[PDB]
Amino acid sequence: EGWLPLSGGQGQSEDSDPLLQQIHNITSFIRQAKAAGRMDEVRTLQENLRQLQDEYDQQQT
Amino acid sequence: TYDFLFKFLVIGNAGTGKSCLLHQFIEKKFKDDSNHTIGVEFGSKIINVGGKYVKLQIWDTAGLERFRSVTRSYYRGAAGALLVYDITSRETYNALTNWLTDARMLASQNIVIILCGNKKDLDADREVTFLEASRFAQENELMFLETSALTGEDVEEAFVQCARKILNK
Ligand SMILES: Nc1nc2c(ncn2[C@@H]2O[C@H](COP(=O)(O)OP(=O)(O)OP(=O)(O)O)[C@@H](O)[C@H]2O)c(=O)[nH]1
Numbered sequence: 001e002g003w004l005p006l007s008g009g010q011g012q013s014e015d016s017d018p019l020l021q022q023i024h025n026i027t028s029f030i031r032q033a034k035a036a037g038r039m040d041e042v043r044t045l046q047e048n049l050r051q052l053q054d055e056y057d058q059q060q061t
Numbered sequence: 062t063y064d065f066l067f068k069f070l071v072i073g074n075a076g077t078g079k080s081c082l083l084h085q086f087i088e089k090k091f092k093d094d095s096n097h098t099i100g101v102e103f104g105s106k107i108i109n110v111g112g113k114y115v116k117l118q119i120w121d122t123a124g125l126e127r128f129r130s131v132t133r134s135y136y137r138g139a140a141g142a143l144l145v146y147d148i149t150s151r152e153t154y155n156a157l158t159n160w161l162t163d164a165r166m167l168a169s170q171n172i173v174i175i176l177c178g179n180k181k182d183l184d185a186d187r188e189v190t191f192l193e194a195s196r197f198a199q200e201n202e203l204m205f206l207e208t209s210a211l212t213g214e215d216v217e218e219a220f221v222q223c224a225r226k227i228l229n230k
């Protein structure tokens with residue numbers, strides 16, 4: 001019985017930066033995974049978040 | 062819980078119904094509030110296939126042009142993809158070669174791809190025939206199903222068939 005986090009629910013507009021937007025998305029999914037006690041998904045998403053933030057920093061050069 | 066873990070992508074033009082397919086697969090409902098994917102959505106689901114439990118880590122990518130760099134960054138490591146077009150929109154079908162090339166380039170040439178002709182419930186509006194899409198699939202080594210995220214037709218089957226082929230050649 002699968003899991004599907006709400007897309008940063010009923011919130012702000014789309015970010016002007018598409019990567020920062022994706023970072024907001026993953027941050028929201030992590031909050032929901034943590035709240036649901038789904039540590040596998042927390043770990044998967046945190047790993048993804050780590051990669052996104054690294055890529056964001058590199059773009060700022 | 063699970064014997065295997067496959068990273069899956071859902072890729073294709075904006076509006077083809079990628080998020081609705083993911084929502085149909087996991088929640089078994091047609092998504093009422095849908096809007097252009099604002100990056101890349103995540104879903105997780107375990108299926109029984111080839112006598113085994115396979116956990117799918119599914120990344121539903123954005124088709125919109127401004128998210129090209131962001132979506133492409135998800136490709137590496139993907140074992141499987143649902144490559145989606147809209148059967149009512151010829152332009153979405155025309156874009157399949159570029160999606161397919163980029164997917165096989167950025168993920169392994171090994172990536173197992175199932176072509177999904179989505180919105181088949183809107184047959185009156187059909188702009189892509191089943192037979193021509195079958196031909197395109199045959200020629201490009203793709204599995205192929207026409208799907209409906211609205212009715213649920215062939216949706217679970219798309220994900221299952223993809224997993225099945227990864228496991229057994
Ligand atoms: N009739 C019908 N409509 C569908 C189907 N699948 C999706 N839609 C509709 O198509 C529109 C686009 O669906 P989405 O799932 O948001 O499309 P998407 O591919 O995720 O779009 P992007 O996020 O921009 O990449 C929505 O209005 C859905 O209601 C379907 O199978 N049948």
Ligand SMILES: [Mg+2]
Nearest residue numbers: 079080097098
């Ligand atoms: Mg979408």
